[PDB]
Amino acid sequence: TSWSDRLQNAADMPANMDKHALKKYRREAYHRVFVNRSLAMEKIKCFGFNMDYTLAVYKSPEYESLGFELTVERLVSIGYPQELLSFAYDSTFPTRGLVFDTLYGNLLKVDAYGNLLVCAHGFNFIRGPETREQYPNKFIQRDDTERFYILNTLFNLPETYLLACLVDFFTNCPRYTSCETGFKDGDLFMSYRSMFQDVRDAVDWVHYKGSLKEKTVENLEKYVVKDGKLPLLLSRMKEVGKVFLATNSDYKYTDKIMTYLFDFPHGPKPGSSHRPWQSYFDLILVDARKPLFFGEGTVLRQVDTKTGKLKIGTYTGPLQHGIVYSGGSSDTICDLLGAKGKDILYIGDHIFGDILKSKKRQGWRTFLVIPELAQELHVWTDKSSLFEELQSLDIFLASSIQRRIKKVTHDMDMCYGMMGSLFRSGSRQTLFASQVMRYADLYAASFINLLYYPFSYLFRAAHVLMPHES
Amino acid sequence: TSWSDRLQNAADMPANMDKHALKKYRREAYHRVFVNRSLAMEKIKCFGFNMDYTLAVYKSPEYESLGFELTVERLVSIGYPQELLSFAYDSTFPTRGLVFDTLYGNLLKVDAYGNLLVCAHGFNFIRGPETREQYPNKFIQRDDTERFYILNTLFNLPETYLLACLVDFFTNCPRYTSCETGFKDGDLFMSYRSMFQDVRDAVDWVHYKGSLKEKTVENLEKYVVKDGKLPLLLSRMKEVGKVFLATNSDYKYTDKIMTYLFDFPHGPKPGSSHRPWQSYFDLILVDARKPLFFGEGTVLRQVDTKTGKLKIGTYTGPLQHGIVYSGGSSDTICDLLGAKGKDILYIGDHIFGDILKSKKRQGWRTFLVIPELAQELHVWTDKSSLFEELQSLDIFLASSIQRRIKKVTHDMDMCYGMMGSLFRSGSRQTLFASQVMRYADLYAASFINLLYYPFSYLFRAAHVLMPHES
Amino acid sequence: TSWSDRLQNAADMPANMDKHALKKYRREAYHRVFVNRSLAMEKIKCFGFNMDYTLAVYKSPEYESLGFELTVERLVSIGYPQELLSFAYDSTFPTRGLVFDTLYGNLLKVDAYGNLLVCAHGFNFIRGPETREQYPNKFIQRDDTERFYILNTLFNLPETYLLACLVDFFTNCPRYTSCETGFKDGDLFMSYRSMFQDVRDAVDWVHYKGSLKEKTVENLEKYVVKDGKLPLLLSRMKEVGKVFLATNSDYKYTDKIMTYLFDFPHGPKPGSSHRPWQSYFDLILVDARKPLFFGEGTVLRQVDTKTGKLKIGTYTGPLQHGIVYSGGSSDTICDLLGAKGKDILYIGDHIFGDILKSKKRQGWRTFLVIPELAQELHVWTDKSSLFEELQSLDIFLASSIQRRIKKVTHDMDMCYGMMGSLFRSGSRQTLFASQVMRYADLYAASFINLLYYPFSYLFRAAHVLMPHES
Amino acid sequence: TSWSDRLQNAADMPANMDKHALKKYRREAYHRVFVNRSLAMEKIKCFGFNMDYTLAVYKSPEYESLGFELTVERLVSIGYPQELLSFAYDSTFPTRGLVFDTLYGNLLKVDAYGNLLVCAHGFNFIRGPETREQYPNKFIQRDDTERFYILNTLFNLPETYLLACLVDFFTNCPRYTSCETGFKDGDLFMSYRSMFQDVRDAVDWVHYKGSLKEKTVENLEKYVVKDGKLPLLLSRMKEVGKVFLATNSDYKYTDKIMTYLFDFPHGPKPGSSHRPWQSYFDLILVDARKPLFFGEGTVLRQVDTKTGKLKIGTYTGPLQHGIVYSGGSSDTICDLLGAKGKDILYIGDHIFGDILKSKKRQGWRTFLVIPELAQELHVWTDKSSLFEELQSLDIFLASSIQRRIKKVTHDMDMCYGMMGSLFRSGSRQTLFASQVMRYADLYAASFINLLYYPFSYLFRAAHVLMPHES
Ligand SMILES: Nc1ncnc2c1ncn2[C@@H]1O[C@H](COP(=O)(O)OP(=O)(O)OP(=O)(O)O)[C@@H](O)[C@H]1O
Ligand SMILES: Nc1ncnc2c1ncn2[C@@H]1O[C@H](COP(=O)(O)OP(=O)(O)OP(=O)(O)O)[C@@H](O)[C@H]1O
Ligand SMILES: O=c1[nH]cnc2c1ncn2[C@@H]1O[C@H](COP(=O)(O)O)[C@@H](O)[C@H]1O
Ligand SMILES: O=c1[nH]cnc2c1ncn2[C@@H]1O[C@H](COP(=O)(O)O)[C@@H](O)[C@H]1O
Ligand SMILES: O=c1[nH]cnc2c1ncn2[C@@H]1O[C@H](COP(=O)(O)O)[C@@H](O)[C@H]1O
Ligand SMILES: O=c1[nH]cnc2c1ncn2[C@@H]1O[C@H](COP(=O)(O)O)[C@@H](O)[C@H]1O
Ligand SMILES: [Mg+2]
Ligand SMILES: [Mg+2]
Ligand SMILES: [Mg+2]
Ligand SMILES: [Mg+2]
């Protein structure tokens, strides 16, 4: 039961909009909206959506596997060894938000301070003493962005696993000699950094020039979660405000995906006429180039929606019915919809490119969709006893207790996968957790959980106090 | 009773090192060390100190007044109007950590998200609706560092007030015409940005080329807090670890100040021989150029301590008794003392240049000295009823209640000064508060509060949980 | 009779290597090597060649037409109007080395000082007084590289003409309104700068992703000059030194072109066994990325010559027989061939990327191939009377004489084409001429002209004197 | 007889403005204006002057000695050894336009291509074979501006000599160990680069914060050439055009110097009333910050001429009688005087900051003052036989002749000083010569030589032809 199985199971249910039914549903953690900072929904005038992994949640592990396969086949086609074709995606290895160290070829799970929580070289998990050889303070400098790459999105799960597969392969293959910073193959030296760049290039190629989109669109039921409740929620938002779409994707792909997401024999509710996806939006913007979008952006263009090509020239005209925009900046949306940032709730999945940048650069209100939460909640509850033990041990710690804390931390972590919870390693929160708490005003397993709250709901978080104020 | 009066009152007391006396003393908030993240003192192998506003706490308002006076006289000497000589420092206006907006000439108190809490143009406090003309989302982009300058240190209190005095002066003087971005004086236009730069240049000049240091050193009892307990604490730290000094100041000034701080007819305790200040340190480093120090640094130099001049050439030798270093990098300290970052507790007052940068760049443990805490605690306790009311109102808020929340927030804020608490405006925490909580492992009114805790004390903070984990 | 007709006519002749025949041949300007700075051929130890427009001279106007056609079809395919398909390359318009002004959409012919010699907006040649509206000092700032683009190579002849065709089209088409910096089409604005970028992108696409190379290789006799004397010259150079190839092209294309250039039923001379092209070179380097090549370069790679793919990893091994390199830097060649810069004569066609950068960055000796010289010499001689008149007029000028100087300048210029000689407009030398004289030690219509000089020839230029030294 | 002796001898003569006397005077090379590119004086509408080493020519070797002495005393005061006080300026060593190599500590005389003509380490002249160890291609990369510093001005003559004195001192002093990139003194390493930076800093300090200006102004007759013909020439220029002053100097110093330059008991000619220096200028601009002046410049300020301080604010008003400007850009002059660049003849001494940048950035007409020309002409003529021999030898060279060419080159060079002619080493022209020919339209020993030519004089240079055009 993957997180996307949980999501599709919930997707297959019709909405019971009886107000008592809604209150009862949102009791369940799965259907809840979690609150980092208070947000009065009556003050939101524009609801903004991202597409991929927000509206269009790709099914797991099928979509990751497909990405993995195509990225492997691209590497082989440019000259990587044929043994790469023996690799097979394993959803139990990667956790999102890991850092690849391009100097030493390690996947790292770190906290917000750059402290090491987990270190794996290939499939070899390095324990604390051994890690001190490469990380003498058990710490990385996060500002060293040329060395350390943060794998933020669900699109990065395939490369996360592939990176580990490659280090494992070259390490254990007798044709190569391992060195601290890469592999020697005769008179050829491949650094981890250049291997990393090849992988990153190959993922990019698969998305831009390869067959990922085509294979996705030819089997949408296999690859994409579909929910009859989507048009219902959007239709309700449009009753109280404006709705916009802002995607890094191109129009032709957006049209195919959004068409699919709205393909039911009805509109917002059963019995209602079907309406085109575009009718649900006051503004549609593709090729957004987030996060640059939230700074200078790019020139505003108009899509010719018949051909799917951009019209030539910068678009200088007003918001018109049926117009589809490309490029621009966050200021385009604000100006055309007449919103200030705090009037906007932007709903996305990319912690950096959607949430952190819209919050910090523009003061937008933010909702982070965390698809894995669906399953992480089930584990958090089913295994709460292990965490409770860990909490008690940590308290009792103010020895053999310390080795028990390590053992329990490991047993807890393993319940999530080889790289542990997205949110923590035992009692230490991850960088991803700290960025969620800091930048995501709201978060949930799915944006659809907003359907279960009334229009004027006040989401509340407790006021924060400093230690000297308590 | 300024914060420095509180600090000197505590300074005049001898240490009662009876273990029961110590436990009882550190009960009081004034004498307490506050904990943002847990820290096991037994793991600290090096204690590092900054000098100014850490070891050498300048008396208030006398030292700010002196800085103010000299900065005014420098501006007048370069051509500013004679009416500046009518200005007189007012300690009731500035709060630390304000942002000067160089485009519109406002002092702003903001939260961690760039949200406006207070906006003053000269001495005119702008209420929310009027602020929307210049700040349509009631928000600033903190990454716009060319526009917004954060006044982080107690050294910035004089310019904070002076900035306000100048905008007030030019606004109300009929020789000048006010414009949105500065003042017209015939065929001369002075932008707020160029005025700001003149002030910043004049403060720098006063410190580097003017008479501030000379006037300070000629009346140290007037300007500098002195505490017999300093050598006691340092002597105790040296029993369990190494002690270093890292200052942005030059050696000649450092020597005069540190000599004064240790000038008692005894050493660590009464009855003991006096020892030179330098004997308390394993490493002394001046001209540190923090925060660059925590990145590339500068070339390591050796001070000729007889002349106070640098020896010519980069110093390539070992740590030797009596050597005094200049420049270098944080890696100099680590290498010469054989420490990794987590073995170091660095004690400073500059939230950015001491604490944030040593934490983020090097994974040092951090202790922030907040001199105003001495007095902010007295107000926090004496006026807790106003905050309690505010908390209750906010709860009751889930109208005339909303105007009561504004009124109570104001009455609370005014107890601290015209720009409110360093840490908050009513229930909204400031940027400075959020940076203290994030980057300062420990904090206190004075580093001396460490004397009241044993060598192997475990400072504990509660583990943090996400909303879905609670 | 295009310049390439002249070149192929000379190419079809067998080499008469009788020493008296050689001396007599190189009398003719067409077969001569011209000398800007003295060069002792006996000191040259390595001869380096570029491929395109050096060894492989593309036939004119056929190859330019093909590039033009494909670039047009790419623009149409991305959304440019169908009327572009009515354009047809005209070899009589463009001269090499023009500057496109992206702000005002003009093609400019300038001198070394940025002084305007010719200005055309579309096909409208702007006379001096009108040009002062846009160029008040009749001058451009050459350091404004974001505004001004120099069209240096024969590869740029198609876009030179296309730029003019486009400005002409949009200016005279009633669907568009002309503005100073581009064209309005309703709510779309297309700036000259964005049009220019579209053209540049489309040329790049044609070369990298389109069909130019494929269509070239399927009719090499149509598109490429072939000369039986090439292997003879290279074979002779290899007798006295080392020979290398350095191309910006990829290996697969290089192999197809070089195979063709050497496809005769003999080797160096008639009667000799044919040898593969690669046997003529001590070092072969593709994907050179000139001019970056002459600075940091890129990582040195090894080509797998069976597949045409790069081997994975940086190549760290020695120069080996049969190895083909990719990337690297000019230092690669020096190190592997054991040459210092002054031991190298590098033969190329790109005034900036081959000649200026190798001279300035590395102190290489330089030979510039100027394919149009073949025909420019015929005009220079056939019409010397017009220039002679101009010279006399200029002398007599120290009025109606001044209008005669303009008239004669024009009549002279028109003999070369609408944009005049590559080297001058009347008596004013072009930027391209000044760069040839400054950076090209030697130059000629073809590198083959080196066959007509002995191994130890001393090419001499007169020593230069300052005005006060004469 | 220094060049400044020659200049003052000519300065002491009254102007005979009889038209036949003028024609005859300008026959002599000393009194001639030399022409690199033709210039019609009737088209010049604005004459622009620099002050230092243009209008105010400092006497040699007295002024260089003074600069040298003060720079030495500054180095000693910051900690350099006392033996520096034994140094004494020697005018026979430095030639202008040398390059200091900060990596290896050599003074280099180079051509326009970075080819080595002379290399001295301290006072040791390194002959060709030995130089190949450090300069394997006998070449430097001029674009490596962090490594190579060009000593362009007469202000750089003292540091040129001092650099050589220092390398000599540390090399031969047994306290220091010489290394390839600097000197070891125990645990101190001083790199040539850091020594160079100390010298550059000390020269800057002497000019900005030391006593150079004060000592100059207290003995102007000792340090500054004065010429009664200056007001005559300026008065004549003002009859046919506008006259401006643009100096990097401050107003107070400019006023003292310009007052002195005009201090005669008469105005333009004997018998005429004396007029203040400022009356000779339509525009006076100080603190020009050339060459930044010819790009973005700085904010335009107004000088308060009573106090010598800048008025506060950017000056936004018109050109007014008596106004003195500070900062700004070259566009300030153009706009306020209503000139385009080709209407301006700018007269200066700094080949880079005055001449090259005004030519390339703005298309100004340029006149370079070369004070040493006064004496270099006397040597060029007196020793023409040596050059003639060299020319003949070079011809005869197309061996013992080659060693004769080296010997004659040396004997010729030594007539100018240890570092040879400014303009050449034997038959090879220097970088400075090539920049003079390229960027200086006109040049002369003194700007005063313009007095000897009529208002509408056409300065002519021969049209340049390429080798294939001859
Ligand atoms: N999740 C992420 N993915 C990619 N880049 C990131 C992410 N988070 C931060 N960055 C960027 O990485 C760079 C270095 O991060 P650094 O730790 O110095 O800053 P920070 O994110 O502000 O740290 P903190 O989380 O302590 O506020 C910055 O440019 C930052 O914007
Ligand atoms: N006389 C000088 N003094 C200081 N800087 C100079 C001088 N002449 C050129 N430069 C600068 O030095 C840098 C490197 O010079 P480089 O040889 O690459 O360019 P260049 O001067 O254009 O050469 P060329 O003389 O061949 O035209 C450039 O930024 C250039 O402007
Ligand atoms: O790593 C990547 N390389 C290239 N494209 C990516 C990558 N990750 C996501 N994308 C693309 O980004 C788009 C998702 O944009 P979204 O709708 O804004 O979430 C899709 O078109 C993806 O193909
Ligand atoms: O704004 C400033 N301008 C110039 N110097 C400053 C400023 N603020 C602090 N300083 C100097 O910084 C030094 C303080 O360094 P610390 O010991 O590292 O805290 C003192 O020498 C101050 O004079
Ligand atoms: O404008 C261009 N855009 C893209 N490729 C170009 C352009 N001009 C030349 N080239 C390519 O550069 C290569 C020529 O390299 P050369 O052998 O070094 O002259 C050929 O592969 C061309 O296709
Ligand atoms: O190397 C230097 N360092 C500092 N000032 C210099 C240097 N060289 C020249 N100057 C100053 O530049 C000014 C000369 O400007 P000019 O009138 O534009 O030639 C004088 O004030 C000099 O003091
Ligand atoms: Mg997304
Ligand atoms: Mg401090
Ligand atoms: Mg080429
Ligand atoms: Mg000067």
Is residue B168 located within the same domain as residue B242? Answer: no
Please state, in angstroms and rounded to a whole number, the distance separating the CA atoms of residues B349 and B370. 6
- Is the CB of residue B347 below 6 angstroms from any atom belonging to ligand 4? no
Is residue D249 located within the same domain as residue D386? Answer: yes
Beta carbons within 8 Å of A265's beta carbon, 6+ residues apart = A274
Please state, in angstroms and rounded to a whole number, the distance separating the CA atoms of residues B171 and A191. 62
Angle at CA of residue C467, ends C466 and D3, nearest 5°: 85
> Beta strands C300-304 and C309-310: pairing type?
antiparallel
CB of D331 less than 8 A from some CB of C: no
Nearest ligand for residue A285 CA? 3
Please state, in angstroms and rounded to a whole number, the distance separating the CA atoms of residues B90 and B61. 8
Beta carbons within 8 Å of A125's beta carbon, 6+ residues apart = A118, A119, A418
Joined tokens for residue B431: 């940027």
Query: Could you tell me the CA-to-CA distances from A404 to A127, A397, A401, A411, C371 in Å, in that order?
Result: 15, 11, 5, 10, 80
- Is the CB of residue D52 below 6 angstroms from any atom belonging to ligand 6? yes
Please state, in angstroms and rounded to a whole number, the distance separating the CA atoms of residues A199 and A67. 12
| Percent of chain D as helix, strand, coil, to the nearest 5 | 45, 20, 40
Name the residue among C328, C77, C313, C303 with its Cα closest to residue C209: C77
Please state, in angstroms and rounded to a whole number, the distance separating the CA atoms of residues B285 and B302. 9
Find, in chain D, the residue whose alpha carbon is nearest to that of C139. D363
Please state, in angstroms and rounded to a whole number, the distance separating the CA atoms of residues D288 and D294. 9
The secondary structure of B105-153 as a DSSP string is TEEEEE-TTSBEEEEEETTEEPPHHHHHHH-TTSB--TT-TTTEEE--S
For chains A and C, CB pairs below 8 A equal 72
CB–CB of C37/C45 below 8 Å? no
Taking an 8 Å cut-off on Cβ atoms, the answer to whether D79 and B309 are in contact is yes
Query: Could you tell me the CA-to-CA distances from D191 to B326, D170, D417 in Å, in that order?
Result: 18, 11, 28
Task: Compute the radius of gyration of chain C from its Cα atoms.
Answer: 23
Count of H-run helices and E-run strands, chain C: 16, 23
Please report, as a single letter, which amino acid is at residue C80.
Answer: Y
What is the enclosing helix (H) or strand (E) of C408? helix C400-414
Look at chain B and report how many structural domains it folds into: 2
CA of A249 to the centre of ligand 3 (A): 6
Count of positions (residues) in chain C: 470
Angle between helices C373-382 and C3-11 (to 10 degrees): 110
Please state, in angstroms and rounded to a whole number, the distance separating the CA atoms of residues B317 and D409. 48
Query: Could you tell me the CA-to-CA distances from B78 to B86, D204, D214 in Å, in that order?
Result: 17, 22, 21
Please state, in angstroms and rounded to a whole number, the distance separating the CA atoms of residues A447 and A371. 10
Please state, in angstroms and rounded to a whole number, the distance separating the CA atoms of residues D206 and D14. 36
Mark residue B328 as left, alpha or beta (left: phi above 0; alpha: psi -120 to 50; beta: remaining).
Answer: left
Taking an 8 Å cut-off on Cβ atoms, the answer to whether C187 and A299 are in contact is no
Taking an 8 Å cut-off on Cβ atoms, the answer to whether A312 and C189 are in contact is no
Beta carbons within 8 Å of B469's beta carbon, 6+ residues apart = A380, A423
Q: How far is CA A93 from the centre of its chain?
A: 17
Q: How far is CA B444 from the centre of its chain?
A: 12
Please report, as a single letter, which amino acid is at residue D12.
Answer: D
Q: Given a contact as 3+ CB pairs under 8 Å, which chains touch A? A: B, C
Please report, as a single letter, which amino acid is at residue C97.
Answer: G
> Beta strands B148-150 and B124-125: pairing type?
unpaired
CA of D160 to the centre of ligand 6 (A): 16
Please report, as a single letter, which amino acid is at residue D358.
Answer: S
Joined tokens for residue D176: 């220091």
Is residue C45 located within the same domain as residue C80? Answer: no
Is residue D266 located within the same domain as residue D153? Answer: no
Query: Of ligand 6's atoms, which has the minimum distance to the CA of residue D288?
Result: 18
CA torsion through residues B143, B145, B148, B150, sign: positive
Task: Mark whether D and C touch (3+ CB pairs within 8 Å).
Answer: yes
Is residue B148 located within the same domain as residue B232? Answer: no
Joined tokens for residue D443: 């040049």
Among A139, A143, A155, A354, name the best residue to mutate to test ligand 1's pocket (greatest count of ligand atoms within 8 A of Cβ).
A143
Report the DSSP beta bridge partners of residue B108. Answer: B99, B119
Is residue A257 located within the same domain as residue A118? Answer: no
Joined tokens for residue A175: 């044709």
Say how many CA atoms lie within 13 Å of C243 toward its Cβ.
17
What is the enclosing helix (H) or strand (E) of D317? none
CB–CB of A310/A326 below 8 Å? yes
CB of B464 less than 8 A from some CB of A: yes
- Is the CB of residue B200 below 6 angstroms from any atom belonging to ligand 4? no
> Beta strands A309-310 and A116-121: pairing type?
unpaired
CB of D360 less than 8 A from some CB of B: no
Please state, in angstroms and rounded to a whole number, the distance separating the CA atoms of residues D198 and D75. 7
For D311, phi and psi rounded to 5 degrees?
A: -70, 155
Q: How far is CA C191 from the centre of its chain?
A: 28
Buried b (16+ CB within 10 A) or exposed e, C455-466: eeeebeeebebb
Joined tokens for residue A387: 């965490």
In angstroms, what separates the C-alpha of B286 from chain D's closest C-alpha? 17
- Is the CB of residue D146 below 6 angstroms from any atom belonging to ligand 2? no
Name the residue among B196, B372, B308, B402 with its Cα closest to residue D79: B308
Taking an 8 Å cut-off on Cβ atoms, the answer to whether B468 and A114 are in contact is no
Angle at CA of residue A272, ends A269 and A278, nearest 5°: 80
Burial class from Cβ neighbours inside 10 Å (0-12, 13-18, 19+) for residue A465 reads middle
Please state, in angstroms and rounded to a whole number, the distance separating the CA atoms of residues D376 and D96. 12
Nearest ligand for residue D350 CA? 10
In angstroms, what separates the C-alpha of D113 from chain C's closest C-alpha? 6
The secondary structure of A273-294 as a DSSP string is PP--GGGG-SEEEES--TTGGG
The secondary structure of C34-71 as a DSSP string is EESS-EEGGG--EEEE-TBTTTBPBPTTHHHHHHHHHH
The secondary structure of A337-383 as a DSSP string is HT--GGGEEEEES-IIIIIIHHHHHH--EEEEE-TTHHHHHHHHHHT
Q: Match 């040396």 to its residue by tokens.
A: D410
Q: How far is CA C383 from the centre of its chain?
A: 24
Query: Of ligand 2's atoms, which has the minimum distance to the CA of residue D356?
Result: 8
Is residue A7 located within the same domain as residue A96? Answer: no
- Domain of B376, in residue numbers: 3-58+224-469
Please state, in angstroms and rounded to a whole number, the distance separating the CA atoms of residues B73 and B208. 15
Say how many CA atoms lie within 13 Å of D51 toward its Cβ.
27
For D184, phi and psi rounded to 5 degrees?
A: -100, 130
Query: Could you tell me the CA-to-CA distances from A351 to A70, A97, A152, A419 in Å, in that order?
Result: 25, 10, 7, 19
Is residue B216 located within the same domain as residue B277? Answer: no
Beta carbons within 8 Å of C349's beta carbon, 6+ residues apart = C50, C52, C53, C54, C153, C154, C368, C369, C370, C371
Cβ count within 10 A of residue C172: 11
Please state, in angstroms and rounded to a whole number, the distance separating the CA atoms of residues D186 and D175. 8
For B139, phi and psi rounded to 5 degrees?
A: -155, 145
CB–CB of A421/A5 below 8 Å? no
CB–CB of A8/A374 below 8 Å? no
Q: Which residues precede chain breaks (C–N over 2.5 Å) in chain B?
A: 398
Beta carbons within 8 Å of C171's beta carbon, 6+ residues apart = C121, C122, C178, C183
Find, in chain D, the residue whose alpha carbon is nearest to that of B77. D309
Is residue A197 located within the same domain as residue A274? Answer: no
Query: Could you tell me the CA-to-CA distances from D377 to D25, D109, D382 in Å, in that order?
Result: 15, 20, 8
For B149, phi and psi rounded to 5 degrees?
A: -120, 125
Report the DSSP beta bridge partners of residue C243. Answer: C47
Q: Match 């012919």 to its residue by tokens.
A: C109
Name the residue among B229, B254, B196 with its Cα closest to residue B56: B254
What residues 202-241 of chain D have any CB closer than 8 A to a CB of chain C? Answer: none
Contacts of D464 in chain C (CB under 8 A): 429, 437
Nearest ligand for residue D99 CA? 2
Name the residue among A335, A330, A332 with its Cα closest to residue A362: A330
Please report, as a single letter, which amino acid is at residue A315.
Answer: Y
Please state, in angstroms and rounded to a whole number, the distance separating the CA atoms of residues D328 and C117. 31
Joined tokens for residue B84: 């500046």
Joined tokens for residue C51: 């491929």
Name the residue among A106, A219, A207, A105 with its Cα closest to residue A153: A207
For B123, phi and psi rounded to 5 degrees?
A: -105, 15
Find, in chain A, the residue whose alpha carbon is nearest to that of C317. A187
Name the residue among D94, D93, D73 with its Cα closest to residue D84: D73
Q: Which of B171, B195, B223 is the last residue of a domain?
A: B223
Helix (H, G, I), strand (E, B) or coil at C177: strand
Joined tokens for residue D352: 């880079």
Joined tokens for residue A244: 């916009």
Give this entry's resolution in angstroms. Answer: 1.9
Q: How far is CA C137 from the centre of its chain?
A: 30
Helix (H, G, I), strand (E, B) or coil at C378: helix
Contacts of B431 in chain A (CB under 8 A): none
Please state, in angstroms and rounded to a whole number, the distance separating the CA atoms of residues D30 and D452. 12
Angle between helices A192-208 and A62-77 (to 10 degrees): 110
Q: Which of B196, B223, B250 is the last residue of a domain?
A: B223
Is residue A22 located within the same domain as residue A115? Answer: no
Query: Could you tell me the CA-to-CA distances from B21 to B268, B452, C4 in Å, in that order?
Result: 19, 9, 101
CB of B322 less than 8 A from some CB of D: no
CB–CB of D300/D332 below 8 Å? yes
Is residue D169 located within the same domain as residue D279? Answer: no
Please state, in angstroms and rounded to a whole number, the distance separating the CA atoms of residues D278 and D258. 8
- Is the CB of residue B351 below 6 angstroms from any atom belonging to ligand 4? no
Q: Which of D203, D223, D243 is the last residue of a domain?
A: D223
Cβ count within 10 A of residue A133: 10
Helix (H, G, I), strand (E, B) or coil at B314: strand
Joined tokens for residue C167: 């400005």
First to last CA, chain C: 43
Buried b (16+ CB within 10 A) or exposed e, A52-62: bbbbbbbbbbb
Q: How far is CA D196 from the centre of its chain?
A: 20
Q: Match 């000299």 to its residue by tokens.
A: B70
Query: Of ligand 1's atoms, which has the minimum distance to the CA of residue A141?
Result: 17
Is residue D372 located within the same domain as residue D404? Answer: yes
Say how many CA atoms lie within 13 Å of D174 toward its Cβ.
0
Q: Match 């960025």 to its residue by tokens.
A: A435
Buried b (16+ CB within 10 A) or exposed e, C303-337: beeeeeebbbbbbeeeeeeebbbbbbbbebbbebb
Contacts of B179 in chain D (CB under 8 A): none
Query: Of ligand 2's atoms, which has the minimum distance to the CA of residue D112?
Result: 25
Closest C-alpha residue for ligand 1 atom 6: A352
For C162, phi and psi rounded to 5 degrees?
A: -60, -45
The secondary structure of D219-272 as a DSSP string is THHHHB---THHHHHHHHHHHHSEEEEE-SS-HHHHHHHHHHHT-SSSSSSTTS
> Beta strands D242-246 and D314-315: pairing type?
unpaired
Q: Match 């000592």 to its residue by tokens.
A: D215
Please state, in angstroms and rounded to a whole number, the distance separating the CA atoms of residues C287 and C249. 5
Task: Mark whether A and B touch (3+ CB pairs within 8 Å).
Answer: yes
Angle at CA of residue A82, ends A80 and A87, nearest 5°: 95
Please state, in angstroms and rounded to a whole number, the distance separating the CA atoms of residues C298 and C314. 10
CB of B330 less than 8 A from some CB of A: no
CB–CB of C373/C53 below 8 Å? no
Contacts of A128 in chain B (CB under 8 A): none
